[PDB]
């Protein structure tokens with residue numbers, strides 16, 4: 001098995017002391033191929049990059065979701081929420097059963113109007129810019145996606161478009177998640193001058209939980225019936241057990257959903273607009289579809305479903321830069337992967353999604369091209385070749401929510417404005433635990449098409 005450069009007792013860990021660790025891992029995969037061993041003090045992971053190996057790893061009879069180091073660290077504030085619980089921890093399956101109905105078609109139809117509310121705020125913001133002002137793309141997409149999950153899920157308005165900097169929840173969330181990403185902290189977390197970081201961390205967690213408090217208080221004070229995600233959290237009963245979620249778990253789900261529910265979707269919208277401005281003929285075709293399909297002053301649910309090419313633009317953005325770029329599995333028993341690589345019970349695998357999605361045996365030699373037409377025919381994409389939403393029963397519960405919101409918003413953007421890559425922007429991918437273009441800016445010239453209420 002290939003392995004990258006080690007550094008004595010630190011093994012491979014210094015390779016990840018960099019601003020862009022996933023990009024570093026992709027380069028290592030480029031050098032070493034479909035599988036490599038990665039060791040840190042205390043742990044071994046095998047990174048997989050080929051569809052033939054990832055297909056086997058996605059067999060749930062042999063491999064289950066693993067909580068990676070990052071997932072274990074963030075559990076300090078995500079707790080035993082859906083993202084951070086083991087498949088055999090009781091509260092995984094219990095919450096899964098209670099919340100799944102909140103992501104049906106019916107539920108999506110119910111969220112649509114509130115998705116439109118936030119989308120209209122974005123379009124209005126851009127209509128109101130003065131000559132020669134520009135748009136900060138990831139910043140505005142984060143405003144939109146946070147507000148969208150807040151309002152759709154919790155009936156809570158973050159009012160991000162009324163602030164010129166991030167909502168304080170975001171500012172604490174980013175520092176709390178960055179603290180966790182500082183996983184290699186002198187491999188001496190109990191050092192001298194981390195009392196500072198540890199204090200700050202608790203303060204950041206407290207800011208997030210005080211917002212959770214307001215969400216729950218506002219719900220309780222409400223005179224109206226919301227019938228949303230929070231409703232199901234508070235009231236829903238697991239049909240396998242008869243039980244509703246306990247209070248502590250509810251708080252962890254709210255934090256889980258507010259975070260997971262916006263950050264990767266902001267990244268996706270930003271990457272999609274990047275690839276559109278860099279591929280003008282693709283932009284033209286998407287914009288022609290938006291104009292033909294979005295014939296009313298605001299979009300209906302059924303219209304968003306008809307933006308097929310827009311859907312393909314999003315899927316092709318997720319192919320090249322899947323914004324949650326890795327998920328971890330473990331071997332349920334001793335087994336052999338790909339007829340060649342023996343694994344012991346409990347061994348960890350990490351699926352490196354961007355490399356999977358560059359597997360030339362699947363996608364051909366145009367892997368780096370942005371070509372949404374690749375997705376014209378679903379059945380021409382082998383099982384387990386495209387996995388931006390994870391796998392099996394632990395796959396993203398929010399997938400259709402993300403894609404409906406992103407399709408609606410990108411469609412409205414393409415209907416209402418012409419975009420200019422005025423700086424000839426050079427892609428710079430900032431990594432947190434997710435991926436996003438940094439410093440991406442455009443200019444938008446309004447086509448002066450009225451919006452509705």
Ligand code: HEM
Nearest residue numbers: 082083260261264265324327389390394395396397398402
């Ligand atoms: C483009 C957007 C998104 C992408 C790329 C994404 C990706 C993923 C991935 C890869 C996983 C599996 C994680 C793992 O195996 O450790 C996952 C799980 C999850 N996602 Fe997403 N997601 C997106 C949007 C959303 C949205 C909008 C929500 C919520 C409204 C959401 C909530 C979750 C939850 C709760 C889980 C845990 C599911 C479980 O194991 O029970 N995600 N997502």
Ligand SMILES: OC(Cn1cncn1)(Cn1cncn1)c1ccc(F)cc1F
Nearest residue numbers: 070071074259260261263264324433434
């Ligand atoms: O998988 C996510 C990605 N993420 C990281 N920061 C924000 N989101 C959560 N998710 C699932 N669908 C959407 N997001 C995750 C991965 C690792 C981790 F520690 C936390 C964490 F939330």
